[PDB]
Design a protein around this ligand. Sequence first.
Ligand SMILES: *[C@@H]1O[C@H](CO)[C@@H](O)[C@H](O)[C@H]1NC(C)=O
Lengths: 49, 48, 106, 122
Amino acid sequence: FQPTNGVGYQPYRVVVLSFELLHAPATVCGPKKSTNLVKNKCVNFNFNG
Amino acid sequence: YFKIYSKHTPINLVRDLPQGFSALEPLVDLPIGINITRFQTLLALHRS
Amino acid sequence: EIVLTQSPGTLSLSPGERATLSCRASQSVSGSYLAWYQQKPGQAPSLLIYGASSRATGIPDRFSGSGSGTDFTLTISRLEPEDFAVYYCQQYVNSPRTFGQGTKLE
Amino acid sequence: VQLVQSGAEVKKPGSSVKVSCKASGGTFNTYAINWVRQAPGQGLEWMGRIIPMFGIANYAQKFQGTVTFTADKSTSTAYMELSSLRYEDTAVYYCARSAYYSESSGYYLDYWGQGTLVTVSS
Ligand SMILES: *[C@@H]1O[C@H](CO)[C@@H](O)[C@H](O)[C@H]1NC(C)=O
């Protein structure tokens, strides 16, 4: 790789991420988009499933 | 799913299995999904 | 609106060598929605390439794209006298199919 | 495959004109037709596209209200109407092909016509 060169001849760092979709172990998960609490009114609740 | 449940208890005996009641609370749940039909233990030995 | 600027405006100067015609855009060209065109004087433009590097029917593979992101390359491997013509770019990303200003104009 | 273009128009300023791009068989239904200005001694500007099956024409912000696109399903001919000849409207209009589809997302100009020269005179 040379500093003054075409981008085709310039470095690209590649970080290949492999993710299998069975998800039975589920070792890595997203934040899961927790909302806020709105008590004192009838609401459809879903605390932790 | 592999479930390992653990508890600790102080005792004051020389050789027995203590009587009484003790509930073993959960510790960890490994989601491994492999067949297990054989198990073994691992000790430690002293040397000098 | 994604403007395109061709960088070598008159690098050719009746070129006898391989070229490195370029195009750059304000927002990166998404999914290689670019094309090149051959506008021989006194005649209409002829498609030279689509996608990033995909060649064209009746156009030799000596014409070679080499772009990604800010898609920027048209490379004449062995230069021939008849192929001289102002070369244009055009992007199908968001833009109302806008064109560049031409790189091989006398 | 061949998209012959109308001849040069002798249009005095303010006088309207309509170009006549002629599609070969099988060109209109499968493919869209698009118009580029190609102003004299200058670059290429995309006026808009004609979908000749669903009669859909969409124009760029610059040319909106100044040009009208029409196409004839029978006789397979493409037309572009200039509202009036403004002084800068002198140019060499070109009609070309397109994809206007999903599976083929390359919306490039497949085949270009000869071109029509509009001016104050000839
Ligand atoms: C466990 O044994 C079953 C027997 O039917 C087999 O189908 C499965 O593939 C085995 N799993 C592993 C991880 O060896």
